[PDB]
Structures are given as C-alpha cells and as structure tokens.
Amino acid sequence: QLIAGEHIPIVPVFGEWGFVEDKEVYEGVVRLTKDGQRLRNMIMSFNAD
Amino acid sequence: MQIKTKGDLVRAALRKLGVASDATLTDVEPQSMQDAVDDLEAMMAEWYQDGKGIITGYVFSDDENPPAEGDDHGLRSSAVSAVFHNLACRIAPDYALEATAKIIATAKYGKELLYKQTAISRAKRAPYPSRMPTGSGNSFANLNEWHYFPGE
Numbered sequence: 001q002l003i004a005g006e007h008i009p010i011v012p013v014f015g016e017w018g019f020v021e022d023k024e025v026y027e028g029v030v031r032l033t034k035d036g037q038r039l040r041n042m043i044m045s046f047n048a049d
Numbered sequence: 050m051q052i053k054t055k056g057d058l059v060r061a062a063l064r065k066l067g068v069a070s071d072a073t074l075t076d077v078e079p080q081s082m083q084d085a086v087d088d089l090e091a092m093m094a095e096w097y098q099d100g101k102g103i104i105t106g107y108v109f110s111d112d113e114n115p116p117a118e119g120d121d122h123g124l125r126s127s128a129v130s131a132v133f134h135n136l137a138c139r140i141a142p143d144y145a146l147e148a149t150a151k152i153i154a155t156a157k158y159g160k161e162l163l164y165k166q167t168a169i170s171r172a173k174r175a176p177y178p179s180r181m182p183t184g185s186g187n188s189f190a191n192l193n194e195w196h197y198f199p200g201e
Contacts, residue, residue, distance in 0.1 A: 042182065
C-alpha cells in the first residue's frame with residue numbers, strides 16, 4: 001500500500017548514540033548507575049536484616 | 050605394610066603398652082585379643098560418625114563373619130600408627146595401667162594428622178548470597194538477564 005511522503009514516517013530520538021564495531025550502541029543516563037544502585041539496595045537490605 | 054589386620058593392630062597396641070610382646074616374655078591371650086578388638090571397633094565407629102567425622106577407610110565387620118579378628122582393617126599406611134597408638138591409649142585402663150607420655154603425645158599427633166586432609170577438604174567457602182548483583186562487568190550474565198546470584 002503506497003503511503004504519502006518521500007521518507008519513512010517514523011522519527012527516532014537518541015541519547016548517547018554511536019557505533020562500536022559496526023554495532024549500534026545507544027545509552028541514556030541509567031545504564032551506568034545500575035551497579036551502584038543495586039549494591040546500595042543490597043547493603044541496605046543486609047543492614048535491615 | 051606388615052600391619053594388615055585388626056589382630057596386627059591389637060598386637061601392636063599391646064606391644065606398645067608392654068602387656069604382651071617379645072620385648073618381654075609375655076604372649077597375647079585370646080581374651081585380651083577379643084576385648085581389644087571390640088574396643089577398637091567401638092572407637093573407630095565413634096570416630097567415623099557415619100561419614101561426618103574422621104575418614105580412614107576402616108572396614109566395619111558385619112555380624113555375618115564370626116571372627117572379627119583376622120579381617121583386614123582397610124586403613125591406609127598413614128593411619129595405622131595413629132589408630133594403634135590411640136587403641137593402646139584406650140585399652141590401657143583395662144589392665145589398670147596408664148599409657149606413657151610418649152604414647153599419649155603420639156596418639157594426639159596421629160589423630161591430628163588423620164584429620165588434617167579432611168579438614169583441608171572440608172574448608173570450603175559458601176556460594177554467593179541470593180541478593181548479590183552479578184555485576185555489569187559480566188557481559189554474558191548482563192545480556193542473559195542473570196542480574197543476581199542464585200544463592201543456597
């Protein structure tokens with residue numbers, strides 16, 4: 001089914017975007033905080049126990 | 050090794066105690082053999098707490114065999130000295146004697162050496178707790194979504 005326009009009607013928005021080895025990588029702001037946050041939650045749980 | 054049977058262990062224990070050996074002119078008496086064999090079986094069964102105690106490879110005689118004396122003990126060569134020294138210490142009070150200080154020290158040393166390897170084997174570290182992260186450095190686990198350790 002032919003649709004109107006010259007371009008694909010989907011518009012993407014990226015954060016930290018690039019290619020490492022012909023492989024796309026996009027990152028937000030939460031990827032690198034995960035380890036610290038999980039460690040903090042684990043330590044607090046241990047302290048409550 | 051020359052010591053291969055429970056009778057050999059009992060003879061060694063009695064010789065160390067001085068009760069009956071060729072160092073003296075005394076010969077081992079059958080009633081002194083049977084009682085010490087029973088004592089040795091009881092002591093080995095106490096040591097080997099159904100696998101949770103000292104491991105020696107000792108073969109426990111079953112009731113089907115009439116003479117317990119004469120069967121091979123099955124101990125390794127490195128356990129015979131400890132076993133028969135401790136047997137001499139244990140059966141010394143039968144004759145209202147007292148084992149000498151060297152015999153007592155050798156018994157202690159032999160028991161410690163008996164348990165040394167099993168202690169090294171059993172000194173094992175527990176696995177990771179069920180509430181640890183696996184870390185993002187482990188790319189395989191991170192992609193598989195193995196974000197936490199199993200536990201137990």
